[PDB]
Swiss-Prot record, chain A:
This is Phosphorylase b kinase regulatory subunit alpha, skeletal muscle isoform. It is found in: Cell membrane. Hexadecamer of 4 heterotetramers, each composed of alpha, beta, gamma, and delta subunits. Alpha (PHKA1 or PHKA2) and beta (PHKB) are regulatory subunits, gamma (PHKG1 or PHKG2) is the catalytic subunit, and delta is calmodulin. Phosphorylase b kinase catalyzes the phosphorylation of serine in certain substrates, including troponin I. The alpha chain may bind calmodulin. The chain holds residues 2 to 88 of 1223 of the full protein. Belongs to the phosphorylase b kinase regulatory chain family. Muscle specific. Isoform 1 is predominant in vastus lateralis muscle. Isoform 2 predominates slightly in heart, and it predominates clearly in the other tissues tested. It is linked to Glycogen storage disease 9D: A metabolic disorder characterized by slowly progressive, predominantly distal muscle weakness and atrophy. Clinical features include exercise intolerance with early fatigability, pain, cramps and occasionally myoglobinuria. Although the final Cys may be farnesylated, the terminal tripeptide is probably not removed, and the C-terminus is not methylated. The gene is PHKA1. It comes from Homo sapiens.
Curated annotation (Swiss-Prot), chain B:
Pathway: Glycan biosynthesis; glycogen metabolism. InterPro entries: 6-hairpin_glycosidase_sf (IPR008928), GH15-like (IPR011613), KPBA/B_C (IPR045583), PHK_A/B_su (IPR008734). This is Phosphorylase b kinase regulatory subunit beta. Although the final Cys may be farnesylated, the terminal tripeptide is probably not removed, and the C-terminus is not methylated. Residues 709-736, 861-892 are annotated as: Calmodulin-binding. It comes from Homo sapiens (Human). One of its GO terms (molecular function) is calmodulin binding. One of its GO terms (biological process) is generation of precursor metabolites and energy.
């Protein structure tokens, strides 16, 4: 009924990824700048920086029996695809 | 027609409110069967259709915005009835639990309830409550109304009960029931019998309810109903096998329209649909209605009302005077609207109008049945359909047929296009010829005619030593550890996981019964407890039986499983077929057959089934995952991790059976140490469990497990004697034998389980694994325990053939196991020459299948004709349509047929049954059963064929006296002697050999003398001048 405790702690990780990485993803291209000062997208860093989104998306997909769990897993998974399509 | 749609709907509102809704029970919501009389009876089948009628008018009133509260009244009149059935059903939850574990007529849900209280009204003795049509229709309509927006299920506790109702419906393929007509058959013996309508309704109920959220739009993952595909598949295999016949007794039934048309639409093949529709239209349509079935005596003038059961001879008097039910004009009317044929709608509307009656207010009354009066029965029989029939229900009497009245509303609303066909069919039970992409309903992505299904085949090796060593031969495989986060399970672990589905400690429901998951179920990808689990097919389990250890059968089991998935997988995703290879399969000469199959899978095709060999991670990425959420909603997140598959890190018997069994001394225990053979051990341990108790201690340990160790160890060597004794003396019984038998008799084939010349038990009706286990070991075989193991060997083997090569057993109406094992054992004598022949218990189960296949062939090539008549005779194989020709024979022999002291008279044989009927086909073999020589059987079966040839092409001749075929066989016999004595003067006297070896067709063949024998006695009779070809002279 209620969401699994793993998903609840993933929301803490979802906040961690969103506040750090996914909030910097370019809406148009899916790329990720290195920082504020460095506004370009390095191929290596973008691939590496998207792993947390990839791992979290896999973790969310692992227990995606509910619409929001499907949707946040889908968003994370296709945020990785956006990045790699952009790259 | 300027009438407003309010006035059109108000017209039906009055009928609905005054004819069926007026009688809805305020307490239970059920609709009484008898409106006048004070009877408390409320039938689920009738009440369900009454709910649909109010629901149908609610759907019509959904098009009126100013409904004046009539949509709510009619929507919630259906909900009140639907919940009342649930209230009655849940009050019988102890029966639902029992019917899940052991489906039986005495453990089933009641189909008749008190309309005012919901209590149990009639016991199993008074009433036949086993009516799967009721439970299936409840599940079907429950999906229909919930999909339309009616909120019937209120909490997960009810969801658990509906899941248990689904479990009761899964097993129905093997459960004979009394059917919709609460009668079973024409004979009224109170005998349950498998009905196409009941099994088809179960198929319709399972398709609509699979993955269905009982909460509607206000629903989450914990209200979806899970359906076992394979029990649904075996329900459909039963439906396709039984059809176009309703059952064994009924070639057709009016109940087929509720099954193959509204509300079920259970047939997905348009050829069969047509075939099955015509037999209803031809043999049951009438002016006043449809006859429920041929020779139906329900409420007929020739029926004794006091007696609840019909005499075996009473069904004869019921021909031509069967009650005609107007309700099936409506069913055809609903069929016409659904199928887009307006001529059908108008034609059956023009037939209802004469049979419709009206109340004092002009409201239509649909009579239950139209019966010929007692004064007009005999005129009706001579010329059917020419005499007036009186209505059962006329209106203005107080007696109303609520099922007919409700179904009138549905058909008329459809006919006047006030409700769309899709409105009463929100979950689409009727699908047009655009038959693609419906789960569980035969409409895959490819559609209705193309079936080039690609099965995802994952190659799994049990150990790395096998993994790398197979890799050295060009085959890529992955050990379970290589596929790590994924879990490869035995199908049992899936059953153990499924044990928690549908449990209600409040209702005392125990969950899904412990039944093996078959190929289609294991073809799905499951996610349990956050772990993605793929179960390999049961065919790879080394516990159920020992033919999985035979590499050739495993290769054929792998092939036929893929063909089984290619034929019966109809879900959105691609099925996953995990292939498990054990070291036993590679060791020895078994590599060469296993490698070619694996190479074929790598090549992409095997058995004509397209397969895709790839890593398990590849074949799992985008497939639909069955979420076993019930294992987490109960907060059982700490449930024990189900045991996934764990990677692993020569002479003939010198001891004869009679040599030491006769030996009275107990020194045989020392002889056990003296001898060195495994079979000698496998016999010595067996007597020790009988002579010295069940769990005596031996050198290795207890007797019970020491024989189990030997059985496990003997199979490793492939010493088949010891593995056959090992499985026989432990009373081993795989889960497949019982369903295999059920597959046999739904094809029209009786099964006998016993050795030749000993007690044989005929399996007329489907039986549970428990009784068949008692059948196959305790009563049937006691001369030799290995008889049962060999008996179970063929049953799976015939189960293998009956599906791949169904034509192979055509004519063989009775699959008699021991009679078949004679055919192989006698064939070994034939092939053995003047040498000690092979033993059927020495042959590997592959050679058992091949020799069985050899001795079954349509025509053995070039063999001794004597021997052919032996192979065909032992199998009791008959020509196609042979049983039909016996009618044409019996139709034209007034005094019948006498053979081997068994007489088949013209009467009451012709009067009692029909000449497509299955019962007559059983009657001939009972008459034919006294012939001991299988070769002598064929020459008689040959003779009955030729006399049928004489009778058909020569209708002028007719027999006077009893046709004693032994004399005709004997008469044609001596003519062969005197002819051959003239040739070479063979000195053998009363020897069939020369007569048997000659081919029928030839210069002087058997059927030539058989033809002469018939004509000599056929010309001994008066010739009848025939008007078909008036004799020119």
């Amino acid at each position: 009924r209620s969401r699994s405790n793993s998903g609840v702690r993933l929301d803490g990780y979802a906040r961690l990824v969103q506040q750090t990485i996914l909030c910097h993803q370019n809406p148009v291209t899916g790329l990720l700048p290195a920082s504020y000062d460095q506004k370009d997208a390095w191929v290596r860093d973008n691939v590496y920086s998207i792993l947390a989104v990839w791992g979290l998306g896999l973790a969310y997909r692992k227990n995606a029996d509910r619409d929001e769990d499907k949707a946040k897993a889908y968003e994370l998974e296709q945020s990785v695809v956006k990045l790699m399509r952009g790259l | 027609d300027n009438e407003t749609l309010w006035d059109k709907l108000d017209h039906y509102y009055r009928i609905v409110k005054s004819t069926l809704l007026l009688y809805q029970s305020p307490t239970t919501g059920l609709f009484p069967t008898k409106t006048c009389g004070g009877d408390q009876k409320a039938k689920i089948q009738d009440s369900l259709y009454c709910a649909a009628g109010a629901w149908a008018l609610a759907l019509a009133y959904r098009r009126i915005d100013d409904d004046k509260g009539r949509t709510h009244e009619l929507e919630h009149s259906a909900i009140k009835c639907m919940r009342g059935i649930l209230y009655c059903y849940m009050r019988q939850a102890d029966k639902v639990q029992q019917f899940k574990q052991d489906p039986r007529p005495t453990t089933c849900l009641h189909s008749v309830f008190n309309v005012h209280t919901g209590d149990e009204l009639l016991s199993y003795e008074e009433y036949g409550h086993l009516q799967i049509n009721a439970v299936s229709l409840y599940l079907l309509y429950l999906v229909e109304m919930i999909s339309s927006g009616l909120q019937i299920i209120y909490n997960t506790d009810e969801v658990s009960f509906i899941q248990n109702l689904v479990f009761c419906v899964e097993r129905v393929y093997r459960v004979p029931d009394f059917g919709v007509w609460e009668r079973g058959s024409k004979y009224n013996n109170g005998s349950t019998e498998l009905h196409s309508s009941s099994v088809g309704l179960a198929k319709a109920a399972l398709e609509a309810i699979n993955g269905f959220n009982l909460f509607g739009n206000q629903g989450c993952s914990w209200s979806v109903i899970f359906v076992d595909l394979d029990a649904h598949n075996r329900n459909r295999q039963t439906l396709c096998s039984l059809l176009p016949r309703e059952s064994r007794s009924h070639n057709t039934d009016a109940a087929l329209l509720p099954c193959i048309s509204y509300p079920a639409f259970a047939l997905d093949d348009e050829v069969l649909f047509s075939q099955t529709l015509d037999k209803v239209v031809r043999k049951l349509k009438g002016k006043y209605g449809f006859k429920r079935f041929l020779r139906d005596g329900y409420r007929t003038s020739l029926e004794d009302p006091n007696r609840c059961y019909y005499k075996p001879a009473e069904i004869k008097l019921f021909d031509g005077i069967e009650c005609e039910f107007p309700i099936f004009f409506l069913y055809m009317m609903i069929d016409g609207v659904f199928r887009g044929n307006p001529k059908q709608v108008q034609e059956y509307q023009d037939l209802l109008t004469p049979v419709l009656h009206h109340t004092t207010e002009g409201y239509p009354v649909v009579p239950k049945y139209y019966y010929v009066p007692a004064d007009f029965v005999e005129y009706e029989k001579n010329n059917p359909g020419s005499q007036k029939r009186f209505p059962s229900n006329c209106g203005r009497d107080g007696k109303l047929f609520l099922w007919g009245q409700a179904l009138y509303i549905i058909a008329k609303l459809l006919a006047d296009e006030l409700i769309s066909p899709k409105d009463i069919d929100p979950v689409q039970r009727y699908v047009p010829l655009k038959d693609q992409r419906n789960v569980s309903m035969r409409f895959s992505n490819q559609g209705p005619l193309e079936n080039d299904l690609v099965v995802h085949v994952a190659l799994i090796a049990e150990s790395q030593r096998l993994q790398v060593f197979l890799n050295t031969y060009g085959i890529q495989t992955q050990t379970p550890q290589q596929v790590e986060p994924i879990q490869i399970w035995p199908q049992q672990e899936l059953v153990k996981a499924y044990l928690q589905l549908g449990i209600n400690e409040k209702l005392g429901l125990s969950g899904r019964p412990d039944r093996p998951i078959g190929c289609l179920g294991t073809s799905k990808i499951y996610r349990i407890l956050g772990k993605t689990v793929v179960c390999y097919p049961i065919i790879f389990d080394l516990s159920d039986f020992y033919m999985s250890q035979d590499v050739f059968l495993l290769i054929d089991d792998i092939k036929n499983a893929l063909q089984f998935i290619k034929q019966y997988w109809k879900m959105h995703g691609r099925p996953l077929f995990l292939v498990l290879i054990r070291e036993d399969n590679i060791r020895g000469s078994r590599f060469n057959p296993i490698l070619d199959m694996l190479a074929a899978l790598k090549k992409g095709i095997i058995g004509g089934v397209k397969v895709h060999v790839d890593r398990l991670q590849t074949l799992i990425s985008g497939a639909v995952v069955e979420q076993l959420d019930f294992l987490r909603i109960s907060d059982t997140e700490e449930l024990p991790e189900f045991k996934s598959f764990e990677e692993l890190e020569g002479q003939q018997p010198d001891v004869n059976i009679s040599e030491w069994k006769d030996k009275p001394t107990h020194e045989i225990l020392q002889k056990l140490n003296d001898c060195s053979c495994l079979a000698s051990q496998a016999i010595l341990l067996g007597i020790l469990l009988k002579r010295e108790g069940p769990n005596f201690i031996t050198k290795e340990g207890t007797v019970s497990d020491h024989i189990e160790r030997v059985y496990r160890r003997a199979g490793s060597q492939k010493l088949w004697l010891a593995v056959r004794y090992g499985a026989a003396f432990t009373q081993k019984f795989s889960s497949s034998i019982a369903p295999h038998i059920t597959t046999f008799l739904v094809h029209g084939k009786q099964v006998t389980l016993g050795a030749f010349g000993h007690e044989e038990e005929v399996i007329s009706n489907p039986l549970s694994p428990r009784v068949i286990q008692n059948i196959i070991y305790y009563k049937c075989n006691t001369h030799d325990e290995r008889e049962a193991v060999i008996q179970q060997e063929l049953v799976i083997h015939i189960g293998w053939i009956i599906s791949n090569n169904p034509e192979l057993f055509s004519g063989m109406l009775k699959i008699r196991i021991g009679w078949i094992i004679h055919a192989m054992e006698y064939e070994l004598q034939i092939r053995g020459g003047d040498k000690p022949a092979l033993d059927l218990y020495q042959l590997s189960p592959s050679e058992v299948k091949q020799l069985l296949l050899d001795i079954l062939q349509p025509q053995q090539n070039g063999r001794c004709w004597l021997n052919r008549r032996q192979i065909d005779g032992s199998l009791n194989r008959t020509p196609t349509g042979f049983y039909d020709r016996v009618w044409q024979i019996l139709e034209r022999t007034p005094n019948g047929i006498i053979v081997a002291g068994k007489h088949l008279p013209q009467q009451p044989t012709l009067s009692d049954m029909t000449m497509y009927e299955m019962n007559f086909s059983l009657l001939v073999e009972d008459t034919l059963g006294n012939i001991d020589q299988p070769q002598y059987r064929q020459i008689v079966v040959e003779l009955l064929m030729v006399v049928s040839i004489v009778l058909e092409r020569n209708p002028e001749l007719e027999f006077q006296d009893k046709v004693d075929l032994d004399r005709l066989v004997k008469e044609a016999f001596n003519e062969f002697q005197k002819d051959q004595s003239r040739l070479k003067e063979i000195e053998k006297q009363d020897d069939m050999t020369s007569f048997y070896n000659t081919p029928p067709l030839g210069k002087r063949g058997t059927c030539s003398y058989l033809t002469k024998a018939v004509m000599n006695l056929l010309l001994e009779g008066e010739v009848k001048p025939n008007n078909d070809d008036p004799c020119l002279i």
